[PDB]
Ligand binder design. Structure first.
Ligand code: HEM
Ligand SMILES: N[C@@H](Cc1c[nH]c2ccccc12)C(=O)O
Length: 351
């Protein structure tokens, strides 16, 4: 009962009439023009009644208001503390979106218009590497989620299982396309120095909300359904996912929650494999699961490398963490998790 967060219906809206302002935002930020930032926040709280907004209006308004707030926070000022009327404006908006009162990578990517209206913090072309990265990744991962969700109720011997899993790996490849756009467009040093500071936490109604981040693409939702399940309860990754659930669009929360409380597909299919008549289609089915896992590795291995060149002493600037407060050890932990799964499947397929 959440369906219908359609990206092009949100990307096209300018509910707070900020299109002109966003063409100036990169120069406002370059020149440290905090006063114009505060003015615009003040103007917004007096110019609009957010209770009047449709759901799509509020999503797009969160995107735009969030990025102005992020630009204030960049300089070191908590924007809700400086503009106290924001707090009820952000309360009203999140009642409608049933999402956090802050922009996430959904707002920064798929819900961010292509072309002249594209919302950007800076004039640096490196910023386009992040935006295109998540704009490409997210719709593909979402498609993969719905496909992997259907694997639980299909038999390994059913060729519909193999086809579904193959569609999922192809959809996940969009995350691979996306990090490749980043690697080719975003210099690590420019990231740490020019872009990362727009992704810091903001205090809203007595709680801190992290900035938008690539880690907010719903890839962890693929992981929990596909291989993590309820199998590593006190793990660091489970704690990250736990902290991420209510950042997700509402439509994805049930899938994530159910999956954290259930055996994973691969654990379920490892049992069916070594307990039923192993046929040629059954091997294809099992091989389609290793295909998905191997596509996840084609994202995580170059991601780890880019994060390592960025967080090196040479390039890291004032930061040792991503927006969610972790170092590259966390990326190493997810990649080693995924490598272990690939190892296990290969071992089950060895004869
Ligand atoms: C210079 C660019 C980038 C750097 C330095 C970087 C670094 C990091 C770091 C340090 C984390 C740990 C979590 C955190 O602290 O927030 C993380 C998480 C993550 N980021 Fe990035 N990242 C970059 C670009 C991207 C892009 C463009 C995407 C998506 C298209 C992405 C996808 C992810 C994912 C999925 C995770 C969760 C871990 C996983 O699923 O393997 N990253 N990243
Ligand atoms: N993926 C990293 C770096 C990052 C920060 N903001 C982003 C926006 C888009 C893509 C990646 C990022 C993170 O989640 O912290």
């Amino acid at each position: 009962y959440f369906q219908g967060m359609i990206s092009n219906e949100i990307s096209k809206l300018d509910p707070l009439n900020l299109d002109a302002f966003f063409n100036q935002l990169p120069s406002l930020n370059q020149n440290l023009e905090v006063s114009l930032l505060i003015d615009k926040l003040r103007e917004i709280t007096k110019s609009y009644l957010p209770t009047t907004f449709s759901i799509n209006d509020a999503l797009a308004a969160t995107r735009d208001l969030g990025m102005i707030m992020s630009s204030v926070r960049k300089l070191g000022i908590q924007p809700v503390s400086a503009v106290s009327d924001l707090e009820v404006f952000l309360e009203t908006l999140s009642e409608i979106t049933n999402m956090v009162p802050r922009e996430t990578s959904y707002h920064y990517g798929p819900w961010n218009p292509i072309g002249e209206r594209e919302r950007r913090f800076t004039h640096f072309p490196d910023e386009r590497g992040l935006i295109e990265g998540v704009r490409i990744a997210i719709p593909g991962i979402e498609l993969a989620i719905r496909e992997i969700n259907q694997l639980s109720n299909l038999s390994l011997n059913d060729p519909a299982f193999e086809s579904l899993a193959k569609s999922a790996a192809l959809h996940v490849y969009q995350a691979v396309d996306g990090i490749g756009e980043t690697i080719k467009k975003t210099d690590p040093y420019v990231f740490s120095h020019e872009l990362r500071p727009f992704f810091d936490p903001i205090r809203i109604g007595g709680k801190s909300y992290i900035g938008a981040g690539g880690g907010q693409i719903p890839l962890f939702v693929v992981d929990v359904k596909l291989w993590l399940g309820n199998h590593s309860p006190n793990s660091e990754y489970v704690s990250f996912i736990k902290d991420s659930v209510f950042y997700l669009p509402p439509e994805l929360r049930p899938i994530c929650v159910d999956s954290l409380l259930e055996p994973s597909v691969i654990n379920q299919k490892f049992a069916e494999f070594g307990s039923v008549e192993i046929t040629d289609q059954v091997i294809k089915g099992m091989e389609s699961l290793l295909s998905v896992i191997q596509v996840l590795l084609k994202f995580r291995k170059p991601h780890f490398q880019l994060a390592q060149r960025t967080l090196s002493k040479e390039n890291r600037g004032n930061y040792t963490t991503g927006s969610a407060g972790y170092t590259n050890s966390f990326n190493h932990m997810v990649l080693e998790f995924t490598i272990e799964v690939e190892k296990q499947i290969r071992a089950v397929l060895a004869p």
